[model samples]
Target: IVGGYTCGANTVPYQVSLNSGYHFCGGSLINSQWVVSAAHCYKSGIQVRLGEDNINVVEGNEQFISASKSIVHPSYNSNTLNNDIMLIKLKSAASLNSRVASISLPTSCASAGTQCLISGWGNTKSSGTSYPDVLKCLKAPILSDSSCKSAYPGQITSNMFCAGYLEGGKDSCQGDSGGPVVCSGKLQGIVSWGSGCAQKNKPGVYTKVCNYVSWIKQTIASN
Candidate 1:
């Protein structure tokens, strides 16, 4: 993300590295056996690395788990970016430790104007060629659905919301998709898509987590 700083080891244990042949997206551990991410972020044959800070060098405190299944939202629309969330079931449950944990999902709606936390290994700039070897974090304040809609008319649906600055220069870029947008210590959004990284009045768009809580629970229960 633009203007992000390197995050420390084990800083966000629930933050995960989603690897499909190579690391292309981020995810969050929702439970010991389940992970939540953007539906558009992964392909088949994906694995997740938990409790990781740096990808180039693996420290002792990490668990590389294979993905058993990826359940994407049935109504997910690629062109429109509606229902852009997915759940990945791990091959085996992760053993939680100090450096490995889960992030809580929001139980209620997240109000507008709250500053949310976002982290990833995406490119530092919109036109950058390389991704960071270490995790990076930035703060993005939530904007109202109406405000987001105005910024991206006919694009921002109810299932989606926006965060970051209207003036630009601080937002999640490519490869940050599927990462968490944590607000008030709860998972509120998932990095879904954007027009351009850190462009003026083009804040990052995210999948609203609270809107799909019932569906998430049902999917997990049925799977």
Candidate 2:
């Protein structure tokens, strides 16, 4: 995450790394056997790592689990980047502990200007290759839908929202897709897309998780 600091060990217990040999995306453990991520991060052979503070180190608290199945949002539109959320079912349930736990889902929508937290192991530089070994987090405020639409005209949709400074400098960049965008200790959004890492008038866009609460519950219940 751009302009963010390394997270304390086990600080983000629900944060997870989506891997295929290496960390490629971030996700959140919502339950013992279910994870939430961005639909665009979907791929075969995905392995989920929980309780990870650093990607490069052999952290003893970590749990490496393989994905048994993945379900992308039915109405997901890649071109427009709408409904960009996905769910992954674990091959086995995770062992919940102080270092590995699930985060609560939001029951209502977050309003504009609400401060939120975003954590990931994505690129730290806006124009260079600088993915961090340790997870990083940033505090960003939700931007209004109108402001977001103005920033990316014709790009922002109801399923998506933007956060970060309008002047740039801080954002969730490449390799951070599918990561959590949390508000008030609840999962509120998922890192989806952006114009770049961080640029003037360009902010990170995220899948509005509040809009998918029922879908998530229903999907998990039936499957």
Candidate 3:
């Protein structure tokens, strides 16, 4: 939540909290039984919390689902942040309610300068250890590939996208990985990586969701 503020109770019902034993990663509900998250978030201890506003507290409408299987992209590369997206097939379909629903995936590509929203329970600063009970959100203006390439020479790829403030401050910090980046009410990106929390000229990198629409649909269909 570096330069972010608390989000409303139902502002983002698709937003999910992923608990990996001792770690925390954010995710998004893409369908009744499918959750898309960063591949790096996969671990032995995987649990999905949906319809949750305050993760630390139990909500009357919240649903806790167990992941039956986690499918990471076959060509995922942690070192390069390539194909960092993954899908969690839940044991059963989520009981969609007012506080639990799937988000719309982008059918078209998002252009540079398009404003987006990122929500998570991550730290407010890179050096901070505290994480919020309620979800936090921040605005991120998508940056051009050239701008991102200049920041991390030869690192940015079409499978990845960048968004943040040039002067720094706003970004997805620790524990925010695998969260959604919504543009025009469509899921366009996933919180994948960044140089740091919110360093100058260091925008947060995301897994371009549009590029994997086919893969996502196919993966879920075949599985």
Candidate 4:
């Protein structure tokens, strides 16, 4: 239902080359100039392919590029998935295809109750099958900060945001890492971590995009 990417060949649904291909978590286009994704997904020349579906198909075109650079919050600590967010500048603009459209970064985002879009090729059945050539997405609200803290015992820091249902089922599973969580058609959060599929006690956590507006702009504008 949302953005899905592949690596390697100039086609979509292309396998992320098993251990070699880059697994695109998720990202949003700031203005047709760059994409915002997790720095973790941008490391080591991991190729980013923009369009196409079903890696088996050959009619689609792909853009083979890597992040020109990255900007992760200094406070970001991988240990706690805190500040686990970053922006990526593709060497050039990625060509958007019908099956793929870059997400839009919102300028008027907030921390309160805001519904967002979450998508990925992550597991559909409890990490049962690791391959989801077809990406699925759904909408969820950004829970109030108080509710987030209530669930994670102080996880809703000023630098982060929380979403997804507190009940079981709907969630981002394995391979869902680093995906972007959009709100009101604007970039708002980045998929960080959680235990299982929408566990009542462990709702999904993400990076608060609101706090990094300046950093994102400065980083992109600098070069």
| Per-residue lDDT of model 2, residues 1-223, tens digit only | 9988888999999999999999999999999999999999999999999999888998689999999999999998888879999999999999999999999999999999999999999999998888889989999999999899999998888888999999889888998899999999999999999988888889999999999999999999999
* Each prediction's RMSD to truth: 1.0, 0.7, 1.1, 4.9
The TM-score-based order of candidates, best leading, equals: 2, 1, 3, 4
List TM-score per model, in order: 0.97, 0.98, 0.97, 0.80
Clash tally for model 2: 1
Off by over 4 Å in 3: 21-23
For model 3, how does the per-residue alpha-carbon lDDT over 111-151 read when each residue is reduced to its tens digit? Answer: 99999999999888866677788899998888999998898
User: What is the per-residue lDDT of model 4 for residues 40-126, given as tens digits with 9 covering 90 to 100?
Assistant: 554555455455344334455545566665666666776776667766666676655544456555576666677766766666665
Model 4 lowest lDDT segment of ten: 10-19
How do these models rank on lDDT, best leading?
A: 2, 1, 3, 4
What's model 4's overall lDDT? 0.61
User: For model 1, what is the alpha-carbon lDDT of residue 102?
Assistant: 92
Local error of candidate 3 at residue 44 (angstroms) = 1.7
Better of 1 and 2 by lDDT: 2
Candidate 4, superposed: residue stretches over 4 Å from native: 1-24, 59-61, 96-101, 127-129
Highest lDDT model number: 2
